[PDB]
Design a protein around this ligand. Sequence first.
Ligand SMILES: *[C@@H]1O[C@H](CO)[C@@H](O[C@@H]2O[C@H](CO)[C@@H](O)[C@H](O)[C@H]2NC(C)=O)[C@H](O)[C@H]1NC(C)=O
Ligand SMILES: *[C@@H]1O[C@H](CO)[C@@H](O[C@@H]2O[C@H](CO)[C@@H](O)[C@H](O)[C@H]2NC(C)=O)[C@H](O)[C@H]1NC(C)=O
Ligand SMILES: *[C@@H]1O[C@H](CO)[C@@H](O)[C@H](O)[C@H]1NC(C)=O
Lengths: 49, 56, 7
Amino acid sequence: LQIPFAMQMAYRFNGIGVTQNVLYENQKLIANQFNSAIGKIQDSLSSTA
Amino acid sequence: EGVFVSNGTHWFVTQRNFYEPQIITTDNTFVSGNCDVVIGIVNNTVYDPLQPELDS
Amino acid sequence: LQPELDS
Ligand SMILES: *[C@@H]1O[C@H](CO)[C@@H](O[C@@H]2O[C@H](CO)[C@@H](O)[C@H](O)[C@H]2NC(C)=O)[C@H](O)[C@H]1NC(C)=O
Ligand SMILES: *[C@@H]1O[C@H](CO)[C@@H](O[C@@H]2O[C@H](CO)[C@@H](O)[C@H](O)[C@H]2NC(C)=O)[C@H](O)[C@H]1NC(C)=O
Ligand SMILES: *[C@@H]1O[C@H](CO)[C@@H](O)[C@H](O)[C@H]1NC(C)=O
């Protein structure tokens, strides 16, 4: 079943007892944290065989 | 609990795993912040069940 | 409730 990805993450947050508005009121920040975290894993593999 | 959902002419709130439309109301929703913050928020009239009972 | 039932 298709779902908009931000609304999927709202249910992922709701599943850990954080009220779902906490995603939507911070979505820009949460995206920048996620993108930056992915960057560090690429660096770890690019260095640490 | 549900998702806001639309058939094109109307908006409803509906539980995730089985389609059932309900009128969007103060008693199936909750408030946070204001309209300037959220990405992709839309305009609709949320019902209040107390409002016709203002006789007292 | 009563802050509305002040009606
Ligand atoms: C969206 O759902 C609403 C509610 O079922 C539909 O509006 C109703 O349409 C019937 C005639 O088909 C009217 O007699 C009712 O009074 C309407 N109800 C309300 C709440 O206005 C609407 O037609 C649906 N639209 C689509 C595109 O499916
Ligand atoms: C949702 O409704 C608001 C009004 O409550 C709309 O805001 C107005 O939009 C016009 C056109 O851009 C502006 O000139 C007004 O200054 C706005 N008024 C206020 C009070 O903000 C808004 O456009 C609607 N949004 C959507 C996505 O439909
Ligand atoms: C959804 O995508 C369209 C272009 O496909 C864009 O115009 C619109 O602003 C987007 N809306 C949201 C809520 O992201």
